[PDB]
Design a binder for these strands. Structure first.
Ligand SMILES: [Mg+2]
Ligand SMILES: [Mg+2]
Ligand SMILES: [Zn+2]
Ligand SMILES: [Zn+2]
Ligand SMILES: [Zn+2]
Ligand SMILES: [Zn+2]
Ligand SMILES: [Zn+2]
Lengths: 513, 131
RNA sequence: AUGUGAUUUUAAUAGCUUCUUAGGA
RNA sequence: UCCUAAGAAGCUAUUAAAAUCACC
């Protein structure tokens, strides 16, 4: 252990060492030649011409700082900013048993995508003339903890077919999410060893035939590609990785995931450890509270979905207030104090979760739980807009994100709840029916006090205006109804689900006229 | 299990050079930006009196030349990746490299930049006398 | 001989420093 | 006041064994 490392550790079982030439370092020369730190050329001992030594690619240390070359590992204030590009990664290994002992070649790779890739055991065997990347003999790990790697060593694909089904899975997942990949690892010690095989870091490059960042390398034709143009490109160009065990975690993976989540399981399979490694790393960064400082790029419909939500929220709240005449209206989870319907008579008690960077409007601080506050708010109606409470009371206007809808916005997350990353990161919990045992669904309708001014005539009882009640429907409200329908359908497509109290009556809006 | 080959002084530059699309350029850029050369090269206690040539079967070292073992003056043999030479075979592995002692604190970075004169066996520009 | 590390101890071995005793200057 | 030999203590390093934690 005198200034040595486990990297490139010769794992052969030949008793002799190496010749003075054809030896990579000074520590690999045999004892017959090594004299006072300066090897001697004995003309008697000839050099080996036929030998194969399995070099162990274990213990890579990516702590380099070079000027043009980006760093692989990232800080968890730069990995929370790239959350669309998290792909968990866990690698199961097989130990070398015949003619080589001492290194774990990779057998089973697994990602957060859900794809297990078996590979043949393949290692870097250092022949006299080159480093012959080739199949070595291996045994699967010992014990009844690893018994599903007993059949896997008799199947799999070579590493020039498991290098192109990693740039066909990453490229199909992250085609539309992001333009980099952040490999969330549990213990980087073996994930780096298993990334020597399909990763080529290099200077920051730009895609061929295109203008996006270059994230896929092709060794056959020496070019680079972004995540769209990578058809046939085999080597992943600069990834970024992150180690979750270096966030102060003491214990196993299934004894650190199973404290936050009861949905995932079946550990020590690669696709179910790479899912837990990302589940634990989404929890430890996002489930605490939404961080309002970290903006996010605009993938698609971010401007339209949010403005449509504001439009429909301005409508449903004002409609329910003008229809049922609630004396006071509460508010929960509204970070700022921004009155949705400011032109109202109700007193807007901002029962926020926590005061956020301003007390100019005296937002109150209160946390909500069902068994605690089931009988605390009895007066009026409480607008739980985008709140995450376990169960809602019997008088509310709720808008909860239905976390079972999958899109390029709604990334998978912890405890079956998901991360809806739209101009901010919201880790909304699982959409269960038990939350809505005091509520009903909301009908679709449009209600306005704007006087009518003087194309297809549309007759729908859902629209609530004195013009559609008459014989002729004005063109001053048909486009309004169509815009509102477009906003509502875009909202429902986005994944929200509106809910309302039991006594909500759409005919109560009519007597207002 | 296994007989260790590397030192922790190398495990920053070797790892970074194991992953590289171009291994020579990445090592030159590591050398430029605050980088220590690859230590632990194999060195020959030669008679140090011999005619100078780049690549020989036995170390023939001039008075201005340190003769190293030819597997530790090749970055690709030293990072265990594939040589860019066609037929993928190393030319330096098996023969003894002669590095001029003025630039022999960093052997690996000499064989990347310099070349061997084909007609007189000397390091071109470092004693090749073809005027 | 059958996998990779990391941290503690417990043995020897080597080096340095401090203290005690003895010999010499 | 200095040099050498022995004993004790401390620090560091090398090998060996054991124990714990993570990876497999
Ligand atoms: Mg793992
Ligand atoms: Mg695992
Ligand atoms: Zn492209
Ligand atoms: Zn989970
Ligand atoms: Zn009208
Ligand atoms: Zn070589
Ligand atoms: Zn010449």
């Amino acid at each position: 252990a005198e200034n040595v490392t486990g990297l490139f550790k010769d794992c052969s079982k030949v008793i002799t060492g190496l010749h003075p030439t054809q030896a990579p370092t000074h520590l690999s020369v045999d004892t017959k030649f090594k004299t006072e730190g300066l090897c001697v050329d004995i003309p008697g001992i000839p050099k080996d011409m036929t030998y194969r030594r399995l070099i162990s690619m274990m213990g890579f240390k990516m702590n380099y700082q070079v000027n043009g070359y980006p760093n692989m590992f990232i800080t968890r204030e730069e990995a929370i900013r790239h959350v669309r590009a998290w792909i968990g990664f866990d690698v199961e290994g097989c130990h070398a048993t015949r003619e080589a002992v001492g290194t774990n070649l990779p057998l089973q790779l697994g990602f957060s995508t859900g794809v297990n890739l078996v590979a043949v055991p393949t290692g870097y065997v250092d022949t006299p003339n080159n480093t012959d990347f080739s199949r070595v003999s291996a045994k699967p790990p010992p014990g009844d903890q690893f018994k599903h790697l007993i059949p896997l060593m008799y199947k799999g694909l070579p590493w020039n077919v498991v290098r192109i089904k990693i740039v066909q899975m990453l490229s199909d997942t992250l085609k539309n999410l992001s333009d980099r990949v952040v490999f969330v690892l549990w213990a980087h010690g073996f994930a780096l060893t298993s990334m020597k095989y399909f990763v080529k870091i290099g200077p920051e490059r730009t895609c061929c035939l295109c203008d996006r960042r270059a994230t896929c390398f092709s060794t056959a034709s020496d070019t680079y590609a972004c995540w769209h143009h990578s058809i046939g490109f085999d080597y992943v160009y600069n990834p970024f990785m992150i180690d979750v065990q270096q966030w102060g975690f003491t214990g196993n993976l299934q004894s650190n995931h199973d404290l936050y989540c009861q949905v995932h399981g079946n550990a020590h399979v690669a696709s179910c450890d790479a899912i837990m490694t990302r589940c634990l790393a989404v929890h430890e960064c996002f489930v605490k509270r939404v961080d309002w400082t970290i903006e996010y790029p605009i993938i698609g419909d971010e401007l339209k979905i949010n403005a449509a939500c504001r439009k429909v929220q301005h409508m449903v709240v004002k409609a329910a207030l003008l229809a049922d005449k609630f004396p006071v209206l509460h508010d929960i989870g509204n970070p700022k104090a921004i009155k949705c319907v400011p032109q109202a008579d109700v007193e807007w008690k901002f029962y926020d979760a926590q005061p956020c960077s301003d007390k100019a409007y005296k937002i109150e601080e209160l946390f909500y739980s069902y068994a605690t506050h089931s009988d605390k708010f009895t007066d009026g109606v409480c607008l739980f807009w985008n709140c995450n409470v376990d169960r809602y009371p019997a008088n509310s206007i709720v808008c909860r994100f239905d976390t079972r809808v999958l899109s390029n916005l709604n990334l998978p997350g912890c405890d079956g709840g998901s991360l809806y990353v739209n101009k901010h990161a919201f880790h909304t919990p699982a959409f269960d029916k038990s939350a809505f045992v005091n509520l009903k669904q909301l009908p679709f309708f449009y209600y306005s006090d704007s006087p009518c001014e003087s194309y297809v005539p549309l007759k729908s009882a859902t629209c609530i205006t004195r013009c559609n009640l008459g014989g002729a429907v004005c063109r001053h409200h048909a486009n309004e109804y169509r815009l509102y329908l477009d906003a509502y359908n875009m909202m429902i497509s986005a994944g929200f689900s509106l809910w309302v109290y039991k006594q909500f009556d759409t005919y109560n809006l009519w007597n207002t006229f | 299990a296994g007989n260790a080959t590397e030192v922790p002084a190398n495990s920053t530059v070797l790892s970074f050079c194991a992953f590289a699309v171009d291994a020579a350029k990445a090592y030159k850029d590591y050398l430029a930006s605050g980088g220590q050369p690859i230590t632990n090269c194999v060195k020959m206690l030669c008679t140090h009196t011999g005619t100078g040539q780049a690549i020989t079967v036995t170390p023939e070292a001039n008075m201005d030349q340190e003769s190293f073992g030819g597997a530790s003056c090749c970055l690709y043999c030293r990072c265990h990746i594939d040589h860019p030479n066609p037929k993928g075979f190393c030319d330096l592995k098996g023969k003894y490299v002669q590095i001029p002692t003025t630039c022999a604190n960093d052997p690996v970075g000499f064989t990347l930049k310099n070349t061997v004169c084909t007609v007189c066996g000397m390091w071109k520009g470092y004693g090749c006398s073809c005027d």
